[PDB]
Design a protein around this ligand. Sequence first.
Ligand SMILES: Nc1ncnc2c1ncn2[C@@H]1O[C@H](COP(=O)(O)O)[C@@H](O)[C@H]1O
Ligand code: NI
Length: 316
Amino acid sequence: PIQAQQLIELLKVHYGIDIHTAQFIQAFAYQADSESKSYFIKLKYGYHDEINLSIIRLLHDSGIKEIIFPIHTLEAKLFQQLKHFKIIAYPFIHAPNGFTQNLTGKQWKQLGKVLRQIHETSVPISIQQQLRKEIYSPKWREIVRSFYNQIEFDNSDDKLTAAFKSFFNQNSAAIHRLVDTSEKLSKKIQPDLDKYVLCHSDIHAGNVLVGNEESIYIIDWDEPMLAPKERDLMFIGGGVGNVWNKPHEIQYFYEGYGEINVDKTILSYYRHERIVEDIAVYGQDLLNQSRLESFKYFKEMFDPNNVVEIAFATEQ
Ligand SMILES: Nc1ncnc2c1ncn2[C@@H]1O[C@H](COP(=O)(O)O)[C@@H](O)[C@H]1O
Ligand code: NI
């Protein structure tokens, strides 16, 4: 939570960079410009998810360009824990995401090609033991069920808490189905750890910086995992963010992927499941500044042509 001069010194110290500016972008981040090059920094409190930087190494090694690589510290490292802590510099990519920038059909093909490399990238048996495995935890559903009961009129509510409690009832049917379906389809999947692949676990329009020309980047590798490829492929046609829902695009994607057979059941299951999770996530939050957003997003999940519909509409 520091300010320019503070940060400006750390970079000059640990990275050797001579930046004159270090704005802040409302774990924190800033756009620290140099005399010639712009950077994107990440200050993260407490040492966490080191189980991320691995994959970036493994991927950069795999020679996948669509992965923004960190900048080296004088110590020749990718970060600057500085006594347990953590700093991460990245060059600055002036580019909007799929929530702003639409992918040209061509670019879609390229997203197909990189998701495939990633899905075909072998994982060091060692690194494989730190990544999480898809076990179909009935956790999430239990968190949403604990909500059926949690809706009662308690004056000690709030203008915002009421609304959610309301809207949730105003859509109880849909939800139970999402839960009950995410429950039934799990009961049709026979875990096959022999097919699990290195999946980016949340690859929606929000995590693809759609640059110019014909260069794109895939980001946020905080929670990569080993699972049925459909874990990622489900986002193609997903509708997350009220985008990536045009069927004519699902084609451009798989043309850069390859037609490797797709288990429509893991695809359906994962589609209801991610919702249940958000409902359980945005949910448990609305029961302090994100509560305003966690409800705006929560409600969009039910708007025309968004994840909830696409989940119930068998368009696979
Ligand atoms: N290297 C970068 N350059 C510019 N913006 C970035 C960079 N990495 C991440 N971002 C921004 O941060 C948002 C969330 O990404 P993440 O910080 O990886 O969760 C993206 O929507 C981008 O707007
Ligand atoms: Ni490189």
